[PDB]
Amino acid sequence: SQVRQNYHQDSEAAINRQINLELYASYVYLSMSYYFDRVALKNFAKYFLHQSHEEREHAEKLMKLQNQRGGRIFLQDIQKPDCDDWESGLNAMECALHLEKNVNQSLLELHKLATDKNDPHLCDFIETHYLNEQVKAIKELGDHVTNLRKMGAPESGLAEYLFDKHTLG
Amino acid sequence: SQVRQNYHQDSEAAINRQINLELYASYVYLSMSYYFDRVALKNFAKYFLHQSHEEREHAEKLMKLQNQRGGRIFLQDIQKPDCDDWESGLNAMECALHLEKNVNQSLLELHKLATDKNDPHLCDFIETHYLNEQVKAIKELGDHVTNLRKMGAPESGLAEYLFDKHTLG
Amino acid sequence: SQVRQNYHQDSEAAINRQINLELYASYVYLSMSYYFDRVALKNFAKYFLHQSHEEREHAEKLMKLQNQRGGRIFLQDIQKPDCDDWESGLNAMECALHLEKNVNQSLLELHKLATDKNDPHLCDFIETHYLNEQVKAIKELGDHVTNLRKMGAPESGLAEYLFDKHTLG
Amino acid sequence: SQVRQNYHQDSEAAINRQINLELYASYVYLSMSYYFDRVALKNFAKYFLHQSHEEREHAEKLMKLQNQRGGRIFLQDIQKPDCDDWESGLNAMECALHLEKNVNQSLLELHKLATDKNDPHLCDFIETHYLNEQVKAIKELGDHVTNLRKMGAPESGLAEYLFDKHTLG
Amino acid sequence: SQVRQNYHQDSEAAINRQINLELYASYVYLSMSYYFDRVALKNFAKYFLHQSHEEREHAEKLMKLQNQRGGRIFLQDIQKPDCDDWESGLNAMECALHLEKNVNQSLLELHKLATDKNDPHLCDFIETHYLNEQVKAIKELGDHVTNLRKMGAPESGLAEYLFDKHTLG
Amino acid sequence: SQVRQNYHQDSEAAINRQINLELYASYVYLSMSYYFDRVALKNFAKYFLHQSHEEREHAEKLMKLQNQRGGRIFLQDIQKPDCDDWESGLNAMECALHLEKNVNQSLLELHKLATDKNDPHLCDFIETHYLNEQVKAIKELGDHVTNLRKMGAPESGLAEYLFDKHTLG
């Protein structure tokens, strides 16, 4: 590649792995969205559909980065989510929180690699477009979990209904 | 399901298979798009990115249909595309044409099943939202293949450059 | 905390210390502002009041960060400023310069800690919202000191009057 | 001071004490605000942040008064609030009510002093800018306490959630 | 300097060297622009003139940085470009690509120095204003080279003419 | 050159020398500008930055002329200015006046050459775009020197401060 410069093969591979993980997160959220479409919590459905589109954008930005740095995108299967039945609004929020913490850990390992390979452009890319977005998403999901639990979810179906209307609406 | 009516278990399964195929088509087009981003044919890249978003919409409409009819969505892995290197604008257009004819065949088998199970709502759904969209997409890809070949692609890099500017721009 | 991830207890403590320092800086500037209100240099008063509001915003952003990362805010007394009588516009500018260099040193020690604990989100937070703001503030105060000295302050009361009108007005 | 007239040294001192108390109230409300930011009651957080800014304005108006009357501002440490963990929306409202009644008592003692020193300008200043503001704030906090208790707080987390949405939102 | 803080003499010197390099890049692009003005490829001329103005802005931002950090600007001769006759649009694009990779390498060495001297403000400055701009410029020039070669340049004068109209126009 | 007509080789060379001198003047003014940025005379800095951009335009117009007449641009190193520390606003204005008189002398020698070679287009070009611009710039710099001296510069730092505000602001 005539453009490649200071771009380690290990970073290229790690970026391909992160592309797959962002697409996976998009698929999990898509599944969650249509679960809540089925069980008639329309604002849970809207919230997770928006999250799913955001993760596709996350994946696309990494694909652009791979090309910008003179690497080559290598795609892999997007694994299906762990569940098709997400049980409750609270359970889906807890699963999303767990997912985003896992994605954050992968981004931190990616940043450690970029640091170890002295790749400041890649470090800046991760910090600028991913790390604070993860922190905000984790706190937001934590906040939703906190409120749903305090309201009496998941036993209180009234709680999940009112949360759908007042927080996600 | 208290809403399910005249919705055969075989149709439910076939709709889940079609959801996966539409997501697969979306992934193929996403791959094609970023291949052309890499090799600097920006309007090929834009064309296939738009196609990829359209297929995600196709998948989402089938997921909504599954829920509307009282079925249950069962997702599967989204397989990676056959190639990561799509070779040329002409080759990608030929591969997309082949893909859309395969998707059309699956939709026609779906319609045959809905006909065999006397499900006129499902027949109408397929006809209204999928069958003419497929015919239009197949003719459009065929037209692109026809013009690229007539211009001298794929040997003529000038041909693919000018097609990118004048047809896809 | 269900949101806390890669957030060292030492960083949490250092962020609480920085919150206190930003509030302290806000209080110093508030004192300076009303000193110049008393001695009738209204644009010195306006300048330092604006600086005081900016430091409160600095403190609030760190409090938000503490919460975002799953830490806990621990507030301490806000110490009164070193003076109630700031003597002259030049002396107040020199004191503000000294204060901002002290705050900068504390932020650099904070960044060293975040670096030592491999916390790239915290490093980015400090760089993005604090480090260049400090450099700009230090140069601006240095510039004000430079001009006031060149004009003949603090002996020339005319100098401070004209600086109030022409630079701070 | 060439402007000082009918301004007793005891009133000057009492005004300096009141400045400190208003800044203290601002700090208490700032603490309460970010507690509710942490535990995800965003409209409690907004309500107390607004209250904190109002108290800073209260302090600034007294600092302006001190200067207007030819006195000298003497600042003291701003003590940290009694708690960092405010327990519940109800508890924070009860603590704020107690604080505002304490501030009101200090303002009434200030007015008694201004009356005893035959300072009608100071009496009018306190009446015009502070006394009715205190009465309104006390009744408002009392009303919030009344409603939260009637709704079942603090045991009912649903109560505090719905109060956050419907009264503070 | 009363403003200088955590700013190593080696970094100051390296910033002066980078100022000279950015001015040099501006001069190379100015030369390329008027070469294409002479041989009547007006959009090549416009493209490189814009690039030349961008590099002057790059140099000016580093001069501002030098002053902001309490250093002193030391200018050196701006060397003339390697060629006055740039041969072809393709050759100029290849020369610009080589230049931008050389400038990128100098910026990465600058970042390594700022890292070695624990200067996070300087690291952030380089990352924020220079490193991604370099990556984008390198990929863009690589893309132009890729397309011109695929079109048949430099032998095909038609290729360079059409590229001037369709990509740079 | 198929366009060259009545364009002597000596004039072509003299135009290349004038291009270099205009770029040199641009560099001197750029240096002066950032000197005043450093020592906090912001309107001196703005004035000289504008002058520096004007000289780059002067150089570009001569480069266009060289091409228009069928000559060839030959660039040379742009020498660094005589000083990096310009001492005072008055000294910089005196140095700029000296520079512009030197540039004027070179333009008058250029016009003498164009006259000697019976090149009326070149004579008109110099008269139309350069000679009156030089006379205006020389008188303007002379006026600035006159006022700064009358105000008490360079000993009076107040003088330079007020001139920065009232004449250059």
Ligand SMILES: [Ca+2]
């Ligand atoms: Ca950065």
Ligand SMILES: [Ca+2]
């Ligand atoms: Ca129909």
Ligand SMILES: [Ca+2]
């Ligand atoms: Ca960063």
Ligand SMILES: [Ca+2]
């Ligand atoms: Ca009254």
Ligand SMILES: [Ca+2]
């Ligand atoms: Ca940064």
Ligand SMILES: [Ca+2]
């Ligand atoms: Ca004429």
Ligand SMILES: [Cl-]
């Ligand atoms: Cl590399």
Ligand SMILES: [Cl-]
């Ligand atoms: Cl981010």
Ligand SMILES: [Cl-]
């Ligand atoms: Cl059925």
Ligand SMILES: [Cl-]
């Ligand atoms: Cl259709």
Ligand SMILES: [Cl-]
């Ligand atoms: Cl942790």
Ligand SMILES: [Cl-]
């Ligand atoms: Cl900053």
Ligand SMILES: [Cl-]
């Ligand atoms: Cl009195």
Ligand SMILES: [Cl-]
């Ligand atoms: Cl009132």
Ligand SMILES: [Cl-]
């Ligand atoms: Cl230093």
Ligand SMILES: [Cl-]
């Ligand atoms: Cl950048």
